[PDB]
Amino acid sequence: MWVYRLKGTLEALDPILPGLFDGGARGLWEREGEVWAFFPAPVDLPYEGVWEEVLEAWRRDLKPALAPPFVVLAPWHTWEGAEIPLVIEPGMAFGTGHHETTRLALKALARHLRPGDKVLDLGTGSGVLAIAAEKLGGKALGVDIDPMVLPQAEANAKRNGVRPRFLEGSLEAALPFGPFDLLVANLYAELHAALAPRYREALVPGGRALLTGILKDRAPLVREAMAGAGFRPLEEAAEGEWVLLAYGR
Amino acid sequence: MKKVVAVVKLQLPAGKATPAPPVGPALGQHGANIMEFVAAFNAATANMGDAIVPVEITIYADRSFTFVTKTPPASYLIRITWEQVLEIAKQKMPDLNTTDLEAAARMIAGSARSMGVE
Numbered sequence A: 001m002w003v004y005r006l007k008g009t010l011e012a013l014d015p016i017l018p019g020l021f022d023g024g025a026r027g028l029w030e031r032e033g034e035v036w037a038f039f040p041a042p043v044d045l046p047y048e049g050v051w052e053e054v055l056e057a058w059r060r061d062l063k064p065a066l067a068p069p070f071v072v073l074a075p076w077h078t079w080e081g082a083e084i085p086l087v088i089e090p091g092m093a094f095g096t097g098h099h100e101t102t103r104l105a106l107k108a109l110a111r112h113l114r115p116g117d118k119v120l121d122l123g124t125g126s127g128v129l130a131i132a133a134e135k136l137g138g139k140a141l142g143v144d145i146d147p148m149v150l151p152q153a154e155a156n157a158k159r160n161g162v163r164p165r166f167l168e169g170s171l172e173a174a175l176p177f178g179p180f181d182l183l184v185a186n187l188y189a190e191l192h193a194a195l196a197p198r199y200r201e202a203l204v205p206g207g208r209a210l211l212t213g214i215l216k217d218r219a220p221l222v223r224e225a226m227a228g229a230g231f232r233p234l235e236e237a238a239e240g241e242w243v244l245l246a247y248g249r
Numbered sequence B: 001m002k003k004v005v006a007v008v009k010l011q012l013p014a015g016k017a018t019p020a021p022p023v024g025p026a027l028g029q030h031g032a033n034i035m036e037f038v039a040a041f042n043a044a045t046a047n048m049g050d051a052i053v054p055v056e057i058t059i060y061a062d063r064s065f066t067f068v069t070k071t072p073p074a075s076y077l078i079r080i081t082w083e084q085v086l087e088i089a090k091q092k093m094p095d096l097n098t099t100d101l102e103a104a105a106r107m108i109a110g111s112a113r114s115m116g117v118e
């Protein structure tokens, strides 16, 4: 990781800032009296500054995360309780199992999923929800638009002795493998709202959708879109800033 | 309250923040939950697409945090001077320090000229 240092505040260097992101900066940081631009690789900039060639506390303090009936474990953990173990290798791919949204979806799966149900996990990442679905007797497809998480999802699956299907893409790619009994989607409010009509098309008549990744204040958008798509509200769950909204068609 | 121990000013791409620098060290030095911020920032700025988002993270003595996202900057909103500041002046209300709804366009259009935009 590289850093390009510039004297002054962020507001003071305002006009030249878009040029720093044109170079390929990943983030700016105002400090004592400087602005710290961060680059993957150093490239010459005529702004005149100084280049410098300069998570594990979280990872080594990482404890098992309870999401009844599950416990989310790193490969280096064990568990003596009665909970269903979910072994997830912590990485850069979302789905470590610790976040509120992931845990809300895990619990919602336990309440809604029937053994034999066809389950679509939209935005599978690490594969945690598709794996959990399989653990509950579901027949899971996990899809992701990022092909890089897919090897990680398959590796996680083998750690758990289950075999969901994993696939690159989104709702479109999932279509030939559906229709589904249950959709689980840990995304974000505005995407749920845009996808609501296609959520209905993805499910069998009487099927259901479990939607999370939704900031509390953004929930009205999802409620409005899902009602507009013809869904009926089933239940809502919350933890901290976040909510899960369950719907039936 | 909740004692404030830091006010961190960052500028991040919308919905694509990571635990990598500056977020890592910026919040990590005060013991704030990096992964919690990353997840929350990304969801809060998700619909904005590729917009550069300035963010202010207030970190407290119990290691918890809150944050505020910005308008964002005019230099991004500038990138041929048309009727730009008929809505940009109303966009720069919660960013500029001037305590007037109207007296803003008389400074944004001038700042746009040197970029250089004609």
Ligand SMILES: Nc1ncnc2c1ncn2[C@@H]1O[C@H](C[C@@H](N)CC[C@H](N)C(=O)O)[C@@H](O)[C@H]1O
Pocket (backbone or CB within 6 Å): A094, A095, A096, A097, A101, A102, A105, A122, A123, A124, A125, A126, A127, A128, A129, A143, A144, A145, A146, A149, A169, A170, A171, A186, A187
């Ligand atoms: N339109 C989309 N279609 C499919 N996947 C998406 C889409 N947008 C984002 N994603 C993926 O969804 C994932 C979102 C994760 N936060 C969810 C991870 C995991 N399912 C969990 O509940 O923890 C990311 O890995 C994205 O790559």
